[PDB]
Amino acid sequence: VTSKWFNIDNKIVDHFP
Amino acid sequence: AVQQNKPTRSKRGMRRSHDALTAVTSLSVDKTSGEKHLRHHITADGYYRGRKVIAK
Amino acid sequence: MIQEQTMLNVADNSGARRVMCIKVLGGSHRRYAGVGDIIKITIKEAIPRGKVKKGDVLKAVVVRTKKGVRRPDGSVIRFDGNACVLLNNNSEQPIGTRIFGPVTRELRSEKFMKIISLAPEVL
Amino acid sequence: MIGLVGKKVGMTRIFTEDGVSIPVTVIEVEANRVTQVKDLANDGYRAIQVTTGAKKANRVTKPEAGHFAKAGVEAGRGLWEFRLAEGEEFTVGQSISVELFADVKKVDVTGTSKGKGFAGTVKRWNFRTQDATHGNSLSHRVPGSIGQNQTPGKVFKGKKMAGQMGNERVTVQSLDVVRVDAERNLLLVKGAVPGATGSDLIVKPAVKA
Amino acid sequence: MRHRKSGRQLNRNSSHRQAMFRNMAGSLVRHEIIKTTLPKAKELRRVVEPLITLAKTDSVANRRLAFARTRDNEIVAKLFNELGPRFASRAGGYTRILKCGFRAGDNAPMAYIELVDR
Amino acid sequence: SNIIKQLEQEQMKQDVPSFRPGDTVEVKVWVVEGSKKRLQAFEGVVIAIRNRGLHSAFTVRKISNGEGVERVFQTHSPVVDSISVKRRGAVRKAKLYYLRERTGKAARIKERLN
RNA sequence: GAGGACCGAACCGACUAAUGUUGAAAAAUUAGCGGAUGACUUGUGGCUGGGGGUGAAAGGCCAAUCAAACCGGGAGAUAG
RNA sequence: CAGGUGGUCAGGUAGAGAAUACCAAGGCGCUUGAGAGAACUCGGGUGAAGGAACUAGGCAAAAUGGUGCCGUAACUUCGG
RNA sequence: UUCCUUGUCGGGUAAGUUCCGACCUGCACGAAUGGCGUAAUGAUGGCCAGGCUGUCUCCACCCGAGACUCAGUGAAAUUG
RNA sequence: GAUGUCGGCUCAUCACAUCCUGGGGCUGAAGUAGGUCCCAAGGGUAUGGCUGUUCGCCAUUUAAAGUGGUACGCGAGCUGGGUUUAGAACGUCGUGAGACAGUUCGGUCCCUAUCUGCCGUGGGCGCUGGAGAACUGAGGGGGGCUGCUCCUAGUACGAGAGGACCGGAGUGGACGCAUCACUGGUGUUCGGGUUGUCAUGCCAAUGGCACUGCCCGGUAGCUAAAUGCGGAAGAGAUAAGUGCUGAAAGCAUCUAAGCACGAAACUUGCCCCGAGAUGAGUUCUCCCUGACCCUUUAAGGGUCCUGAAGGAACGUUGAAGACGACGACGUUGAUAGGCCGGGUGUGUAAGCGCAGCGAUGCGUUGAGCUAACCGGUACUAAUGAACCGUGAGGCUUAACCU
Numbered sequence A: 001v002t003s004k005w006f007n008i009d010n011k012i013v014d015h016f017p
Numbered sequence B: 001a002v003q004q005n006k007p008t009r010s011k012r013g014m015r016r017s018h019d020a021l022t023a024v025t026s027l028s029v030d031k032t033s034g035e036k037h038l039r040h041h042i043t044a045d046g047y048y049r050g051r052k053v054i055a056k
Numbered sequence C: 001m002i003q004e005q006t007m008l009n010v011a012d013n014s015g016a017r018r019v020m021c022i023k024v025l026g027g028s029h030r031r032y033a034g035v036g037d038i039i040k041i042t043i044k045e046a047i048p049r050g051k052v053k054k055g056d057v058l059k060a061v062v063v064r065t066k067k068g069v070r071r072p073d074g075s076v077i078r079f080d081g082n083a084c085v086l087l088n089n090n091s092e093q094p095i096g097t098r099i100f101g102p103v104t105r106e107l108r109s110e111k112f113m114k115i116i117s118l119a120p121e122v123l
Numbered sequence D: 001m002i003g004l005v006g007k008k009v010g011m012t013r014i015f016t017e018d019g020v021s022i023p024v025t026v027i028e029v030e031a032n033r034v035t036q037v038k039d040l041a042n043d044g045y046r047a048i049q050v051t052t053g054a055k056k057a058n059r060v061t062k063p064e065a066g067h068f069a070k071a072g073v074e075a076g077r078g079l080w081e082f083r084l085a086e087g088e089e090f091t092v093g094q095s096i097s098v099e100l101f102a103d104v105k106k107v108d109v110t111g112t113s114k115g116k117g118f119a120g121t122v123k124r125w126n127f128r129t130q131d132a133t134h135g136n137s138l139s140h141r142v143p144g145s146i147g148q149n150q151t152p153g154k155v156f157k158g159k160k161m162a163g164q165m166g167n168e169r170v171t172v173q174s175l176d177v178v179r180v181d182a183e184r185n186l187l188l189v190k191g192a193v194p195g196a197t198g199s200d201l202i203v204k205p206a207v208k209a
Numbered sequence E: 001m002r003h004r005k006s007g008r009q010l011n012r013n014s015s016h017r018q019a020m021f022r023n024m025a026g027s028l029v030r031h032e033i034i035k036t037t038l039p040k041a042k043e044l045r046r047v048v049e050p051l052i053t054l055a056k057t058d059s060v061a062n063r064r065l066a067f068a069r070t071r072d073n074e075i076v077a078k079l080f081n082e083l084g085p086r087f088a089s090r091a092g093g094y095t096r097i098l099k100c101g102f103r104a105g106d107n108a109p110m111a112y113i114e115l116v117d118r
Numbered sequence F: 001s002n003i004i005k006q007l008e009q010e011q012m013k014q015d016v017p018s019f020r021p022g023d024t025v026e027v028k029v030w031v032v033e034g035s036k037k038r039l040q041a042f043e044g045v046v047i048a049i050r051n052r053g054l055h056s057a058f059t060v061r062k063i064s065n066g067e068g069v070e071r072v073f074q075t076h077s078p079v080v081d082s083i084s085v086k087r088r089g090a091v092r093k094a095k096l097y098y099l100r101e102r103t104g105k106a107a108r109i110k111e112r113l114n
Numbered sequence G: 001g002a003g004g005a006c007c008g009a010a011c012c013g014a015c016u017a018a019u020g021u022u023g024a025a026a027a028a029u030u031a032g033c034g035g036a037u038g039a040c041u042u043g044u045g046g047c048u049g050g051g052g053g054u055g056a057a058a059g060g061c062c063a064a065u066c067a068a069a070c071c072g073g074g075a076g077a078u079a080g
Numbered sequence H: 001c002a003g004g005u006g007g008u009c010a011g012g013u014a015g016a017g018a019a020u021a022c023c024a025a026g027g028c029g030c031u032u033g034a035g036a037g038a039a040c041u042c043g044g045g046u047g048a049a050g051g052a053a054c055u056a057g058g059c060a061a062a063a064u065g066g067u068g069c070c071g072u073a074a075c076u077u078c079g080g
Numbered sequence I: 001u002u003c004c005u006u007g008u009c010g011g012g013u014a015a016g017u018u019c020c021g022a023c024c025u026g027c028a029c030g031a032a033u034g035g036c037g038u039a040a041u042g043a044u045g046g047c048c049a050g051g052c053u054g055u056c057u058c059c060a061c062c063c064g065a066g067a068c069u070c071a072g073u074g075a076a077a078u079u080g
Numbered sequence J: 001g002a003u004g005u006c007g008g009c010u011c012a013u014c015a016c017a018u019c020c021u022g023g024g025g026c027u028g029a030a031g032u033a034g035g036u037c038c039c040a041a042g043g044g045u046a047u048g049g050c051u052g053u054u055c056g057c058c059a060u061u062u063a064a065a066g067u068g069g070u071a072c073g074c075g076a077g078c079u080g081g082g083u084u085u086a087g088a089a090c091g092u093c094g095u096g097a098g099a100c101a102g103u104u105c106g107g108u109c110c111c112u113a114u115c116u117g118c119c120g121u122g123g124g125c126g127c128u129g130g131a132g133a134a135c136u137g138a139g140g141g142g143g144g145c146u147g148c149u150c151c152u153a154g155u156a157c158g159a160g161a162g163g164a165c166c167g168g169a170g171u172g173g174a175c176g177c178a179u180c181a182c183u184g185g186u187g188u189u190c191g192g193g194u195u196g197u198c199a200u201g202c203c204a205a206u207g208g209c210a211c212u213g214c215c216c217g218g219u220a221g222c223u224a225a226a227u228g229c230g231g232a233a234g235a236g237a238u239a240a241g242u243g244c245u246g247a248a249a250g251c252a253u254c255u256a257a258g259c260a261c262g263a264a265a266c267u268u269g270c271c272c273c274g275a276g277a278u279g280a281g282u283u284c285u286c287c288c289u290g291a292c293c294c295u296u297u298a299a300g301g302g303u304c305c306u307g308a309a310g311g312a313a314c315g316u317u318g319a320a321g322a323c324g325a326c327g328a329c330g331u332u333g334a335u336a337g338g339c340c341g342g343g344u345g346u347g348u349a350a351g352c353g354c355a356g357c358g359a360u361g362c363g364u365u366g367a368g369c370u371a372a373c374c375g376g377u378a379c380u381a382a383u384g385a386a387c388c389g390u391g392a393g394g395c396u397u398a399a400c401c402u
Ligand SMILES: N[C@@H](Cc1c[nH]c2ccccc12)C(=O)O
Pocket: A005, A006, A008, A009, G021, G027, J108
C-alpha cells in the first residue's frame, strides 16, 4: 500500500531546513 | 493518541467492575390470572390489574 | 450607543454634515457613548464656507441616538438617526449658534446649558 | 441578627408618586417555627433551628416526625439554622414572622441558582471565541491553550474549563427593603434574587453597610 | 437548556412530525386501538384528544377545521357521528396508554393506546 | 400567582381610554424643570401596544422639527397624566413598524369612520 | 446573417472556500466559478516503444510507477 | 463503494427554454434501529446599536439580479 | 530591476513601510535573450471608494445531522 | 531509526530590577507640579493607520499603557502572511548547467486520548448495631482596580500667577455575580398576508411541496445591549520610616532591658466548597427485647420463626439533568396529559345576507383560532403486593448505682 499522505507532504515532513 | 504501554489484564477487569447487569427484582402477580409480569405492564395473556384489556 | 467608526449627523450650523467618531473619551476600554457623552470626532463632509473644514479633529457631544435613552419609570425615547453638536477642543463649548431638531433632558447640566437654550424642543 | 426562610413568588414593579418604577422581588415569608435551641453547654455554639411551610403527613418519616413532636410544632418543608448573636434569646415553639424586618433597611438573600447544566468555557468563564472565518478549522468555541510546554509539563489546579454551571448556593448582598407587609406575609426587596420561582430563600440582615 | 418547554422532537424535523401524527391520529380513530412506541403514544394524546373535543359540537366550521387537521373524510365522519356523541359527557381523558413488551428488532419500549369506551 | 396579581391590581389606573394602533393620540407627561412641575404634550400615531396588565405599554411615533421620534410610554405610570384620542385610524395590522420607512404622503393612515 | 462574437443549460474543464484526511472516495462532495460553432468535444478502430516515443514545454505524460517504464536474467552486483 | 460509462425516447401547468418549481406514465424511501434534547463539531435560519473597527488580504457571508422604455462619461485601433 | 531605503517632495487618511504623481544619487534599465506606449480582453498582481453585511465590537437564540443513553453487529494505529 | 520555524489568535502562570494605585527619607521641596532613593507584587496595566512583521514611527486615549522567565510559554488548541521543495520572471554573477540572508507572482498543516495532569459527575467500601435529618470547621478556593465633580476652600502657601494636605459626599469606566419586573433579540411547536403548482369530484373552503417557499407580527423559555448588587469599613501582627524613656560610654543615642505608632503586601473580617479532617467529629429523633443444634469453645458455624425504622426498585415527572445524581408526587392523590375558566398573541374566520357588471367592500364581528403561561378540575395514567435491610450491638480500664 501507499504511505500516509502526511508523511509524503513536503510542508509537514521538511519542517527543519 | 494511542497507548505507550499495553494495559494489563488487571486494569481491564477494574474498568469492567461497573459493566455488570442488574436483574429485575419486581415480578408481580396478576390478581385474576396469577401470571407474572413486569409492573405497570400487561401480562403475556393480555391482562392488566385484573381485567382483560386486549383481546388477542 | 456610539463607538469608533460610527458616522453621525450634525445638529448645529457649524458647517459640518457628517462626522466620524474616532474615540470614546472617559476611561480605558470604554466602548459606547450614549446621549450626553463627549466624543472625539473627525469631519468627513462639510459645506463650502462653514466655520470648520473637512479633515478637522474636534470634540462633540451626542444629543440623539437610534438606541435612545431610558427614563426612571421605564420609558424609552428613540430617534431616527444619531446626531451630535461640535465643541471646541479645549474649552469644550459649542461652535455653532443654532441647534436643529429636538434634544433630551440628559443634556440639562451646567456644561451644556447653551445647547438646551438654543434647542427648538427638549424632550 | 437572625434571618427568616421565605419563598420566591416572582418579580413585579412598584410605582412611586415621583414616577420612579422600582423592580421588586416578592418573597412570601410565612411564620417560622422554632424547633430547637442550641447552646454552649450541650452543642458548643448558640443557634436556633426553624421550620416553615407544611408537609404531607404520609411523607414525614418517623425520625423526622419525632423531632417535631418533641418541639411541639407541626412538620414543615425542611429545617434551617441561624447563628445567634449574644443577647438574643428564643424558646422552642416560638413563632417568628416577617415584622422582624420592620426596621431593617438592607438584607442579604441566599438561594440556589438556576441550573444551566454542562456549560462551555464561553458561557461559564466569558472566554473569547476565535475567528468564525479566515481559515479556522473546527475551533470556533474551543478553549485554546491550557498550559505551557515542558516547564511545568502539567495543567495547574483551578484552570478554567467547561463543566457544571449554576444550581449552587449564591448570596446577593445589600438589597433595599421596599415594603414589609405582615397581614399577607410579604416582603418586597428591590432587585433580583437567585433561584427560580417557587424556590427557597434565606433572608438575613445585611452584614455590611 | 430546555427549561419549561413542551413537545418532543422525536429525531425528526418539523414537517415529518406533523405528517406522522396526522397519520397516527387517523389510525387511532379508525381502529380504536393501536400499538406504537411509548414516547409516540404520549405525544399522540396532545393531537387526538383536542380533535375529540372539537367534534363534540357539530357545525360546518368545525367539520372543515377537523378536515384541515386530518385530511381524511372518513375520519371526520366518524369523529362527528360516533366519537363526539360517545364522549359527550366526559371531561378529557379520552385515551388510555397500556405498557407492553419491548420490541424485538430494536428493544424499543412499546405501548397500546386505545379509546376509553372501546 | 394570586399573590402578585393582587399586588398589581391595586396599582393599576382605572380610566385609561380605549385606543388601537393607527389612532392619533395626545399624551400629557409630567416634566420637572428644576423645582417646578408642568405638563407637556406628545402627539403622534400609536404604532404598537403591549397588553400585560400593570406592565402595559404603547409606542407613539411623531415627526418633530424634521426628525422622527418614537416614545414608549408605560401605561400605568404616574408620569403619564392623561391619554386622549384625536383621530381613529383604519389599519389591518397590530404593529405599524412599516411606518418607519415611510414619510410624507406615503405614511398617511385612513380614518376608521365606524 | 459574418464572428477562434455575447448571455446561458447539456457537454468539456477546475479559480475560491468549507468538509473529509484509519475518507462515501489511494484526489471526491457541497456552494459558488471558466469555455460553451470551435486552436471545441465525444464513440469505435488504427500507428509511434525505453536513452526511445509523444510533448501549445510543466522533466509533463507513456496502465494508481517516470531526470530514463515494467517483467525475466547477469545475480548471492558491490557495500572500508 | 456518494466516483466513471457511448447512443435512443422526450407528457402537463407556468417559462425563452432540454434552466427552474410542482406534477403524469413509471419508479422509489437509499439493509441498523429506539430514546434524550449537555459541552463541542458539522449544515442552515434570524438578530438590538454600530458597519471592515476583523484580517496578511472584505477570506467567508451579506448584497445585486427579469422584461419594456428613458438615459449614459473619459478614452478608442471607430468595432467598442 | 534601488542595497543604502520606510530616499525626498506632492496626493489620498485623524494617523499610509503598501498605492498614485514627480525628482534622478540607474549599488546593478535600455533597444527583436527587443525599448517605450497602447483601445479591448484576464477565475492575473497592488491600491481606493459607494452599497452591503455576525468579518468584528460581542455574541444570543432557534432548526436539523453527530456527540450522550439503550438493544444488535463490531474495527484501527500503538505496545520491554 | 525526526525534540515542527517567525509573527498573529486563544488561554495563561511566575519573578520583582514597580508603569499606576499604597507607605516613607532627602531635596538647589513656598503652593501646584516635580527630581532622587527606600518599603511594597493585592488588584490593574489601550484602541487604531502602515508593514508578514516582533520592533518602530504616527493619530487619539488612559490612573497607568511595567521589565523579564515559562522549549525567545502555548500548531496531538487554531492560522499559514513571512521564511523554507517542485512553476515563472527581473537585476546581478557564470561560456554553461545554474546561483544570490537580492527582489517579485503562485504554492495539500494528519491523529477516534491508554497513562500523568486538569474541569465536572457518579459507584464501592470504611467511619464498629442500623436508620433519617440538622450542624461544627481542620483545611481549601473566590474577591481585593480606579477616574472625575462638589464641599471643606479660593481657605493654608504665594509679590502675583496660581493653588493644597487631612476629612466628607455624589456620580462614572473596566471587571464579576445574580436575574427576566422593564427595554429588546430569538421564538421552523401561535396568528396572518402572499407567488407557482398538485390534490381533496367541482364552486367555495382547505392541505402538500418549493430554504420555515417568500414575508409580517408574536407566547413561554433562554438571553444582553436590559437592571439589581459587589470590591469595603473594622481588627491583629508588621515593612521602610518616626518616636518615648535609657545605659553601655557621668555627655549623646529609637535599643542593649522596657514602651508606642506605622502600608492595597501578611492573619482575619466578606462570599463559596468542606468530617475519606482514616485525627473519619457533634447534636436531635426513630427502630429491633425469639427458639434449637453442632464443632475445632470463639468477636464460631448452621436450622426454624421473625423482617422493624428505613431504603431501593417501578410508575407519573421537574425551573434538576449527557448518563448516574438531585427534587416533587403515586388514589388518604393536583405528579404529568386532557378538560374548564382566564390571560396573551394575531387581527374582524367560515357560512349567510346586502351593494357592485366584476375584482372587491360592508354587516353578523374585535370575530375566529391561539405553544411552552395563570387559576382550577380525578376524566386518563401514577397497583394489592414483591425485593433489600434484622432480632439489642466486642474487649480493657476508670468514675458512679447496686
Ligand atoms: N490530504 C488529501 C490530499 C492528498 C492525497 N495524497 C497526498 C499526498 C501528499 C499530500 C497530500 C495528499 C487526501 O488525503 O485526500
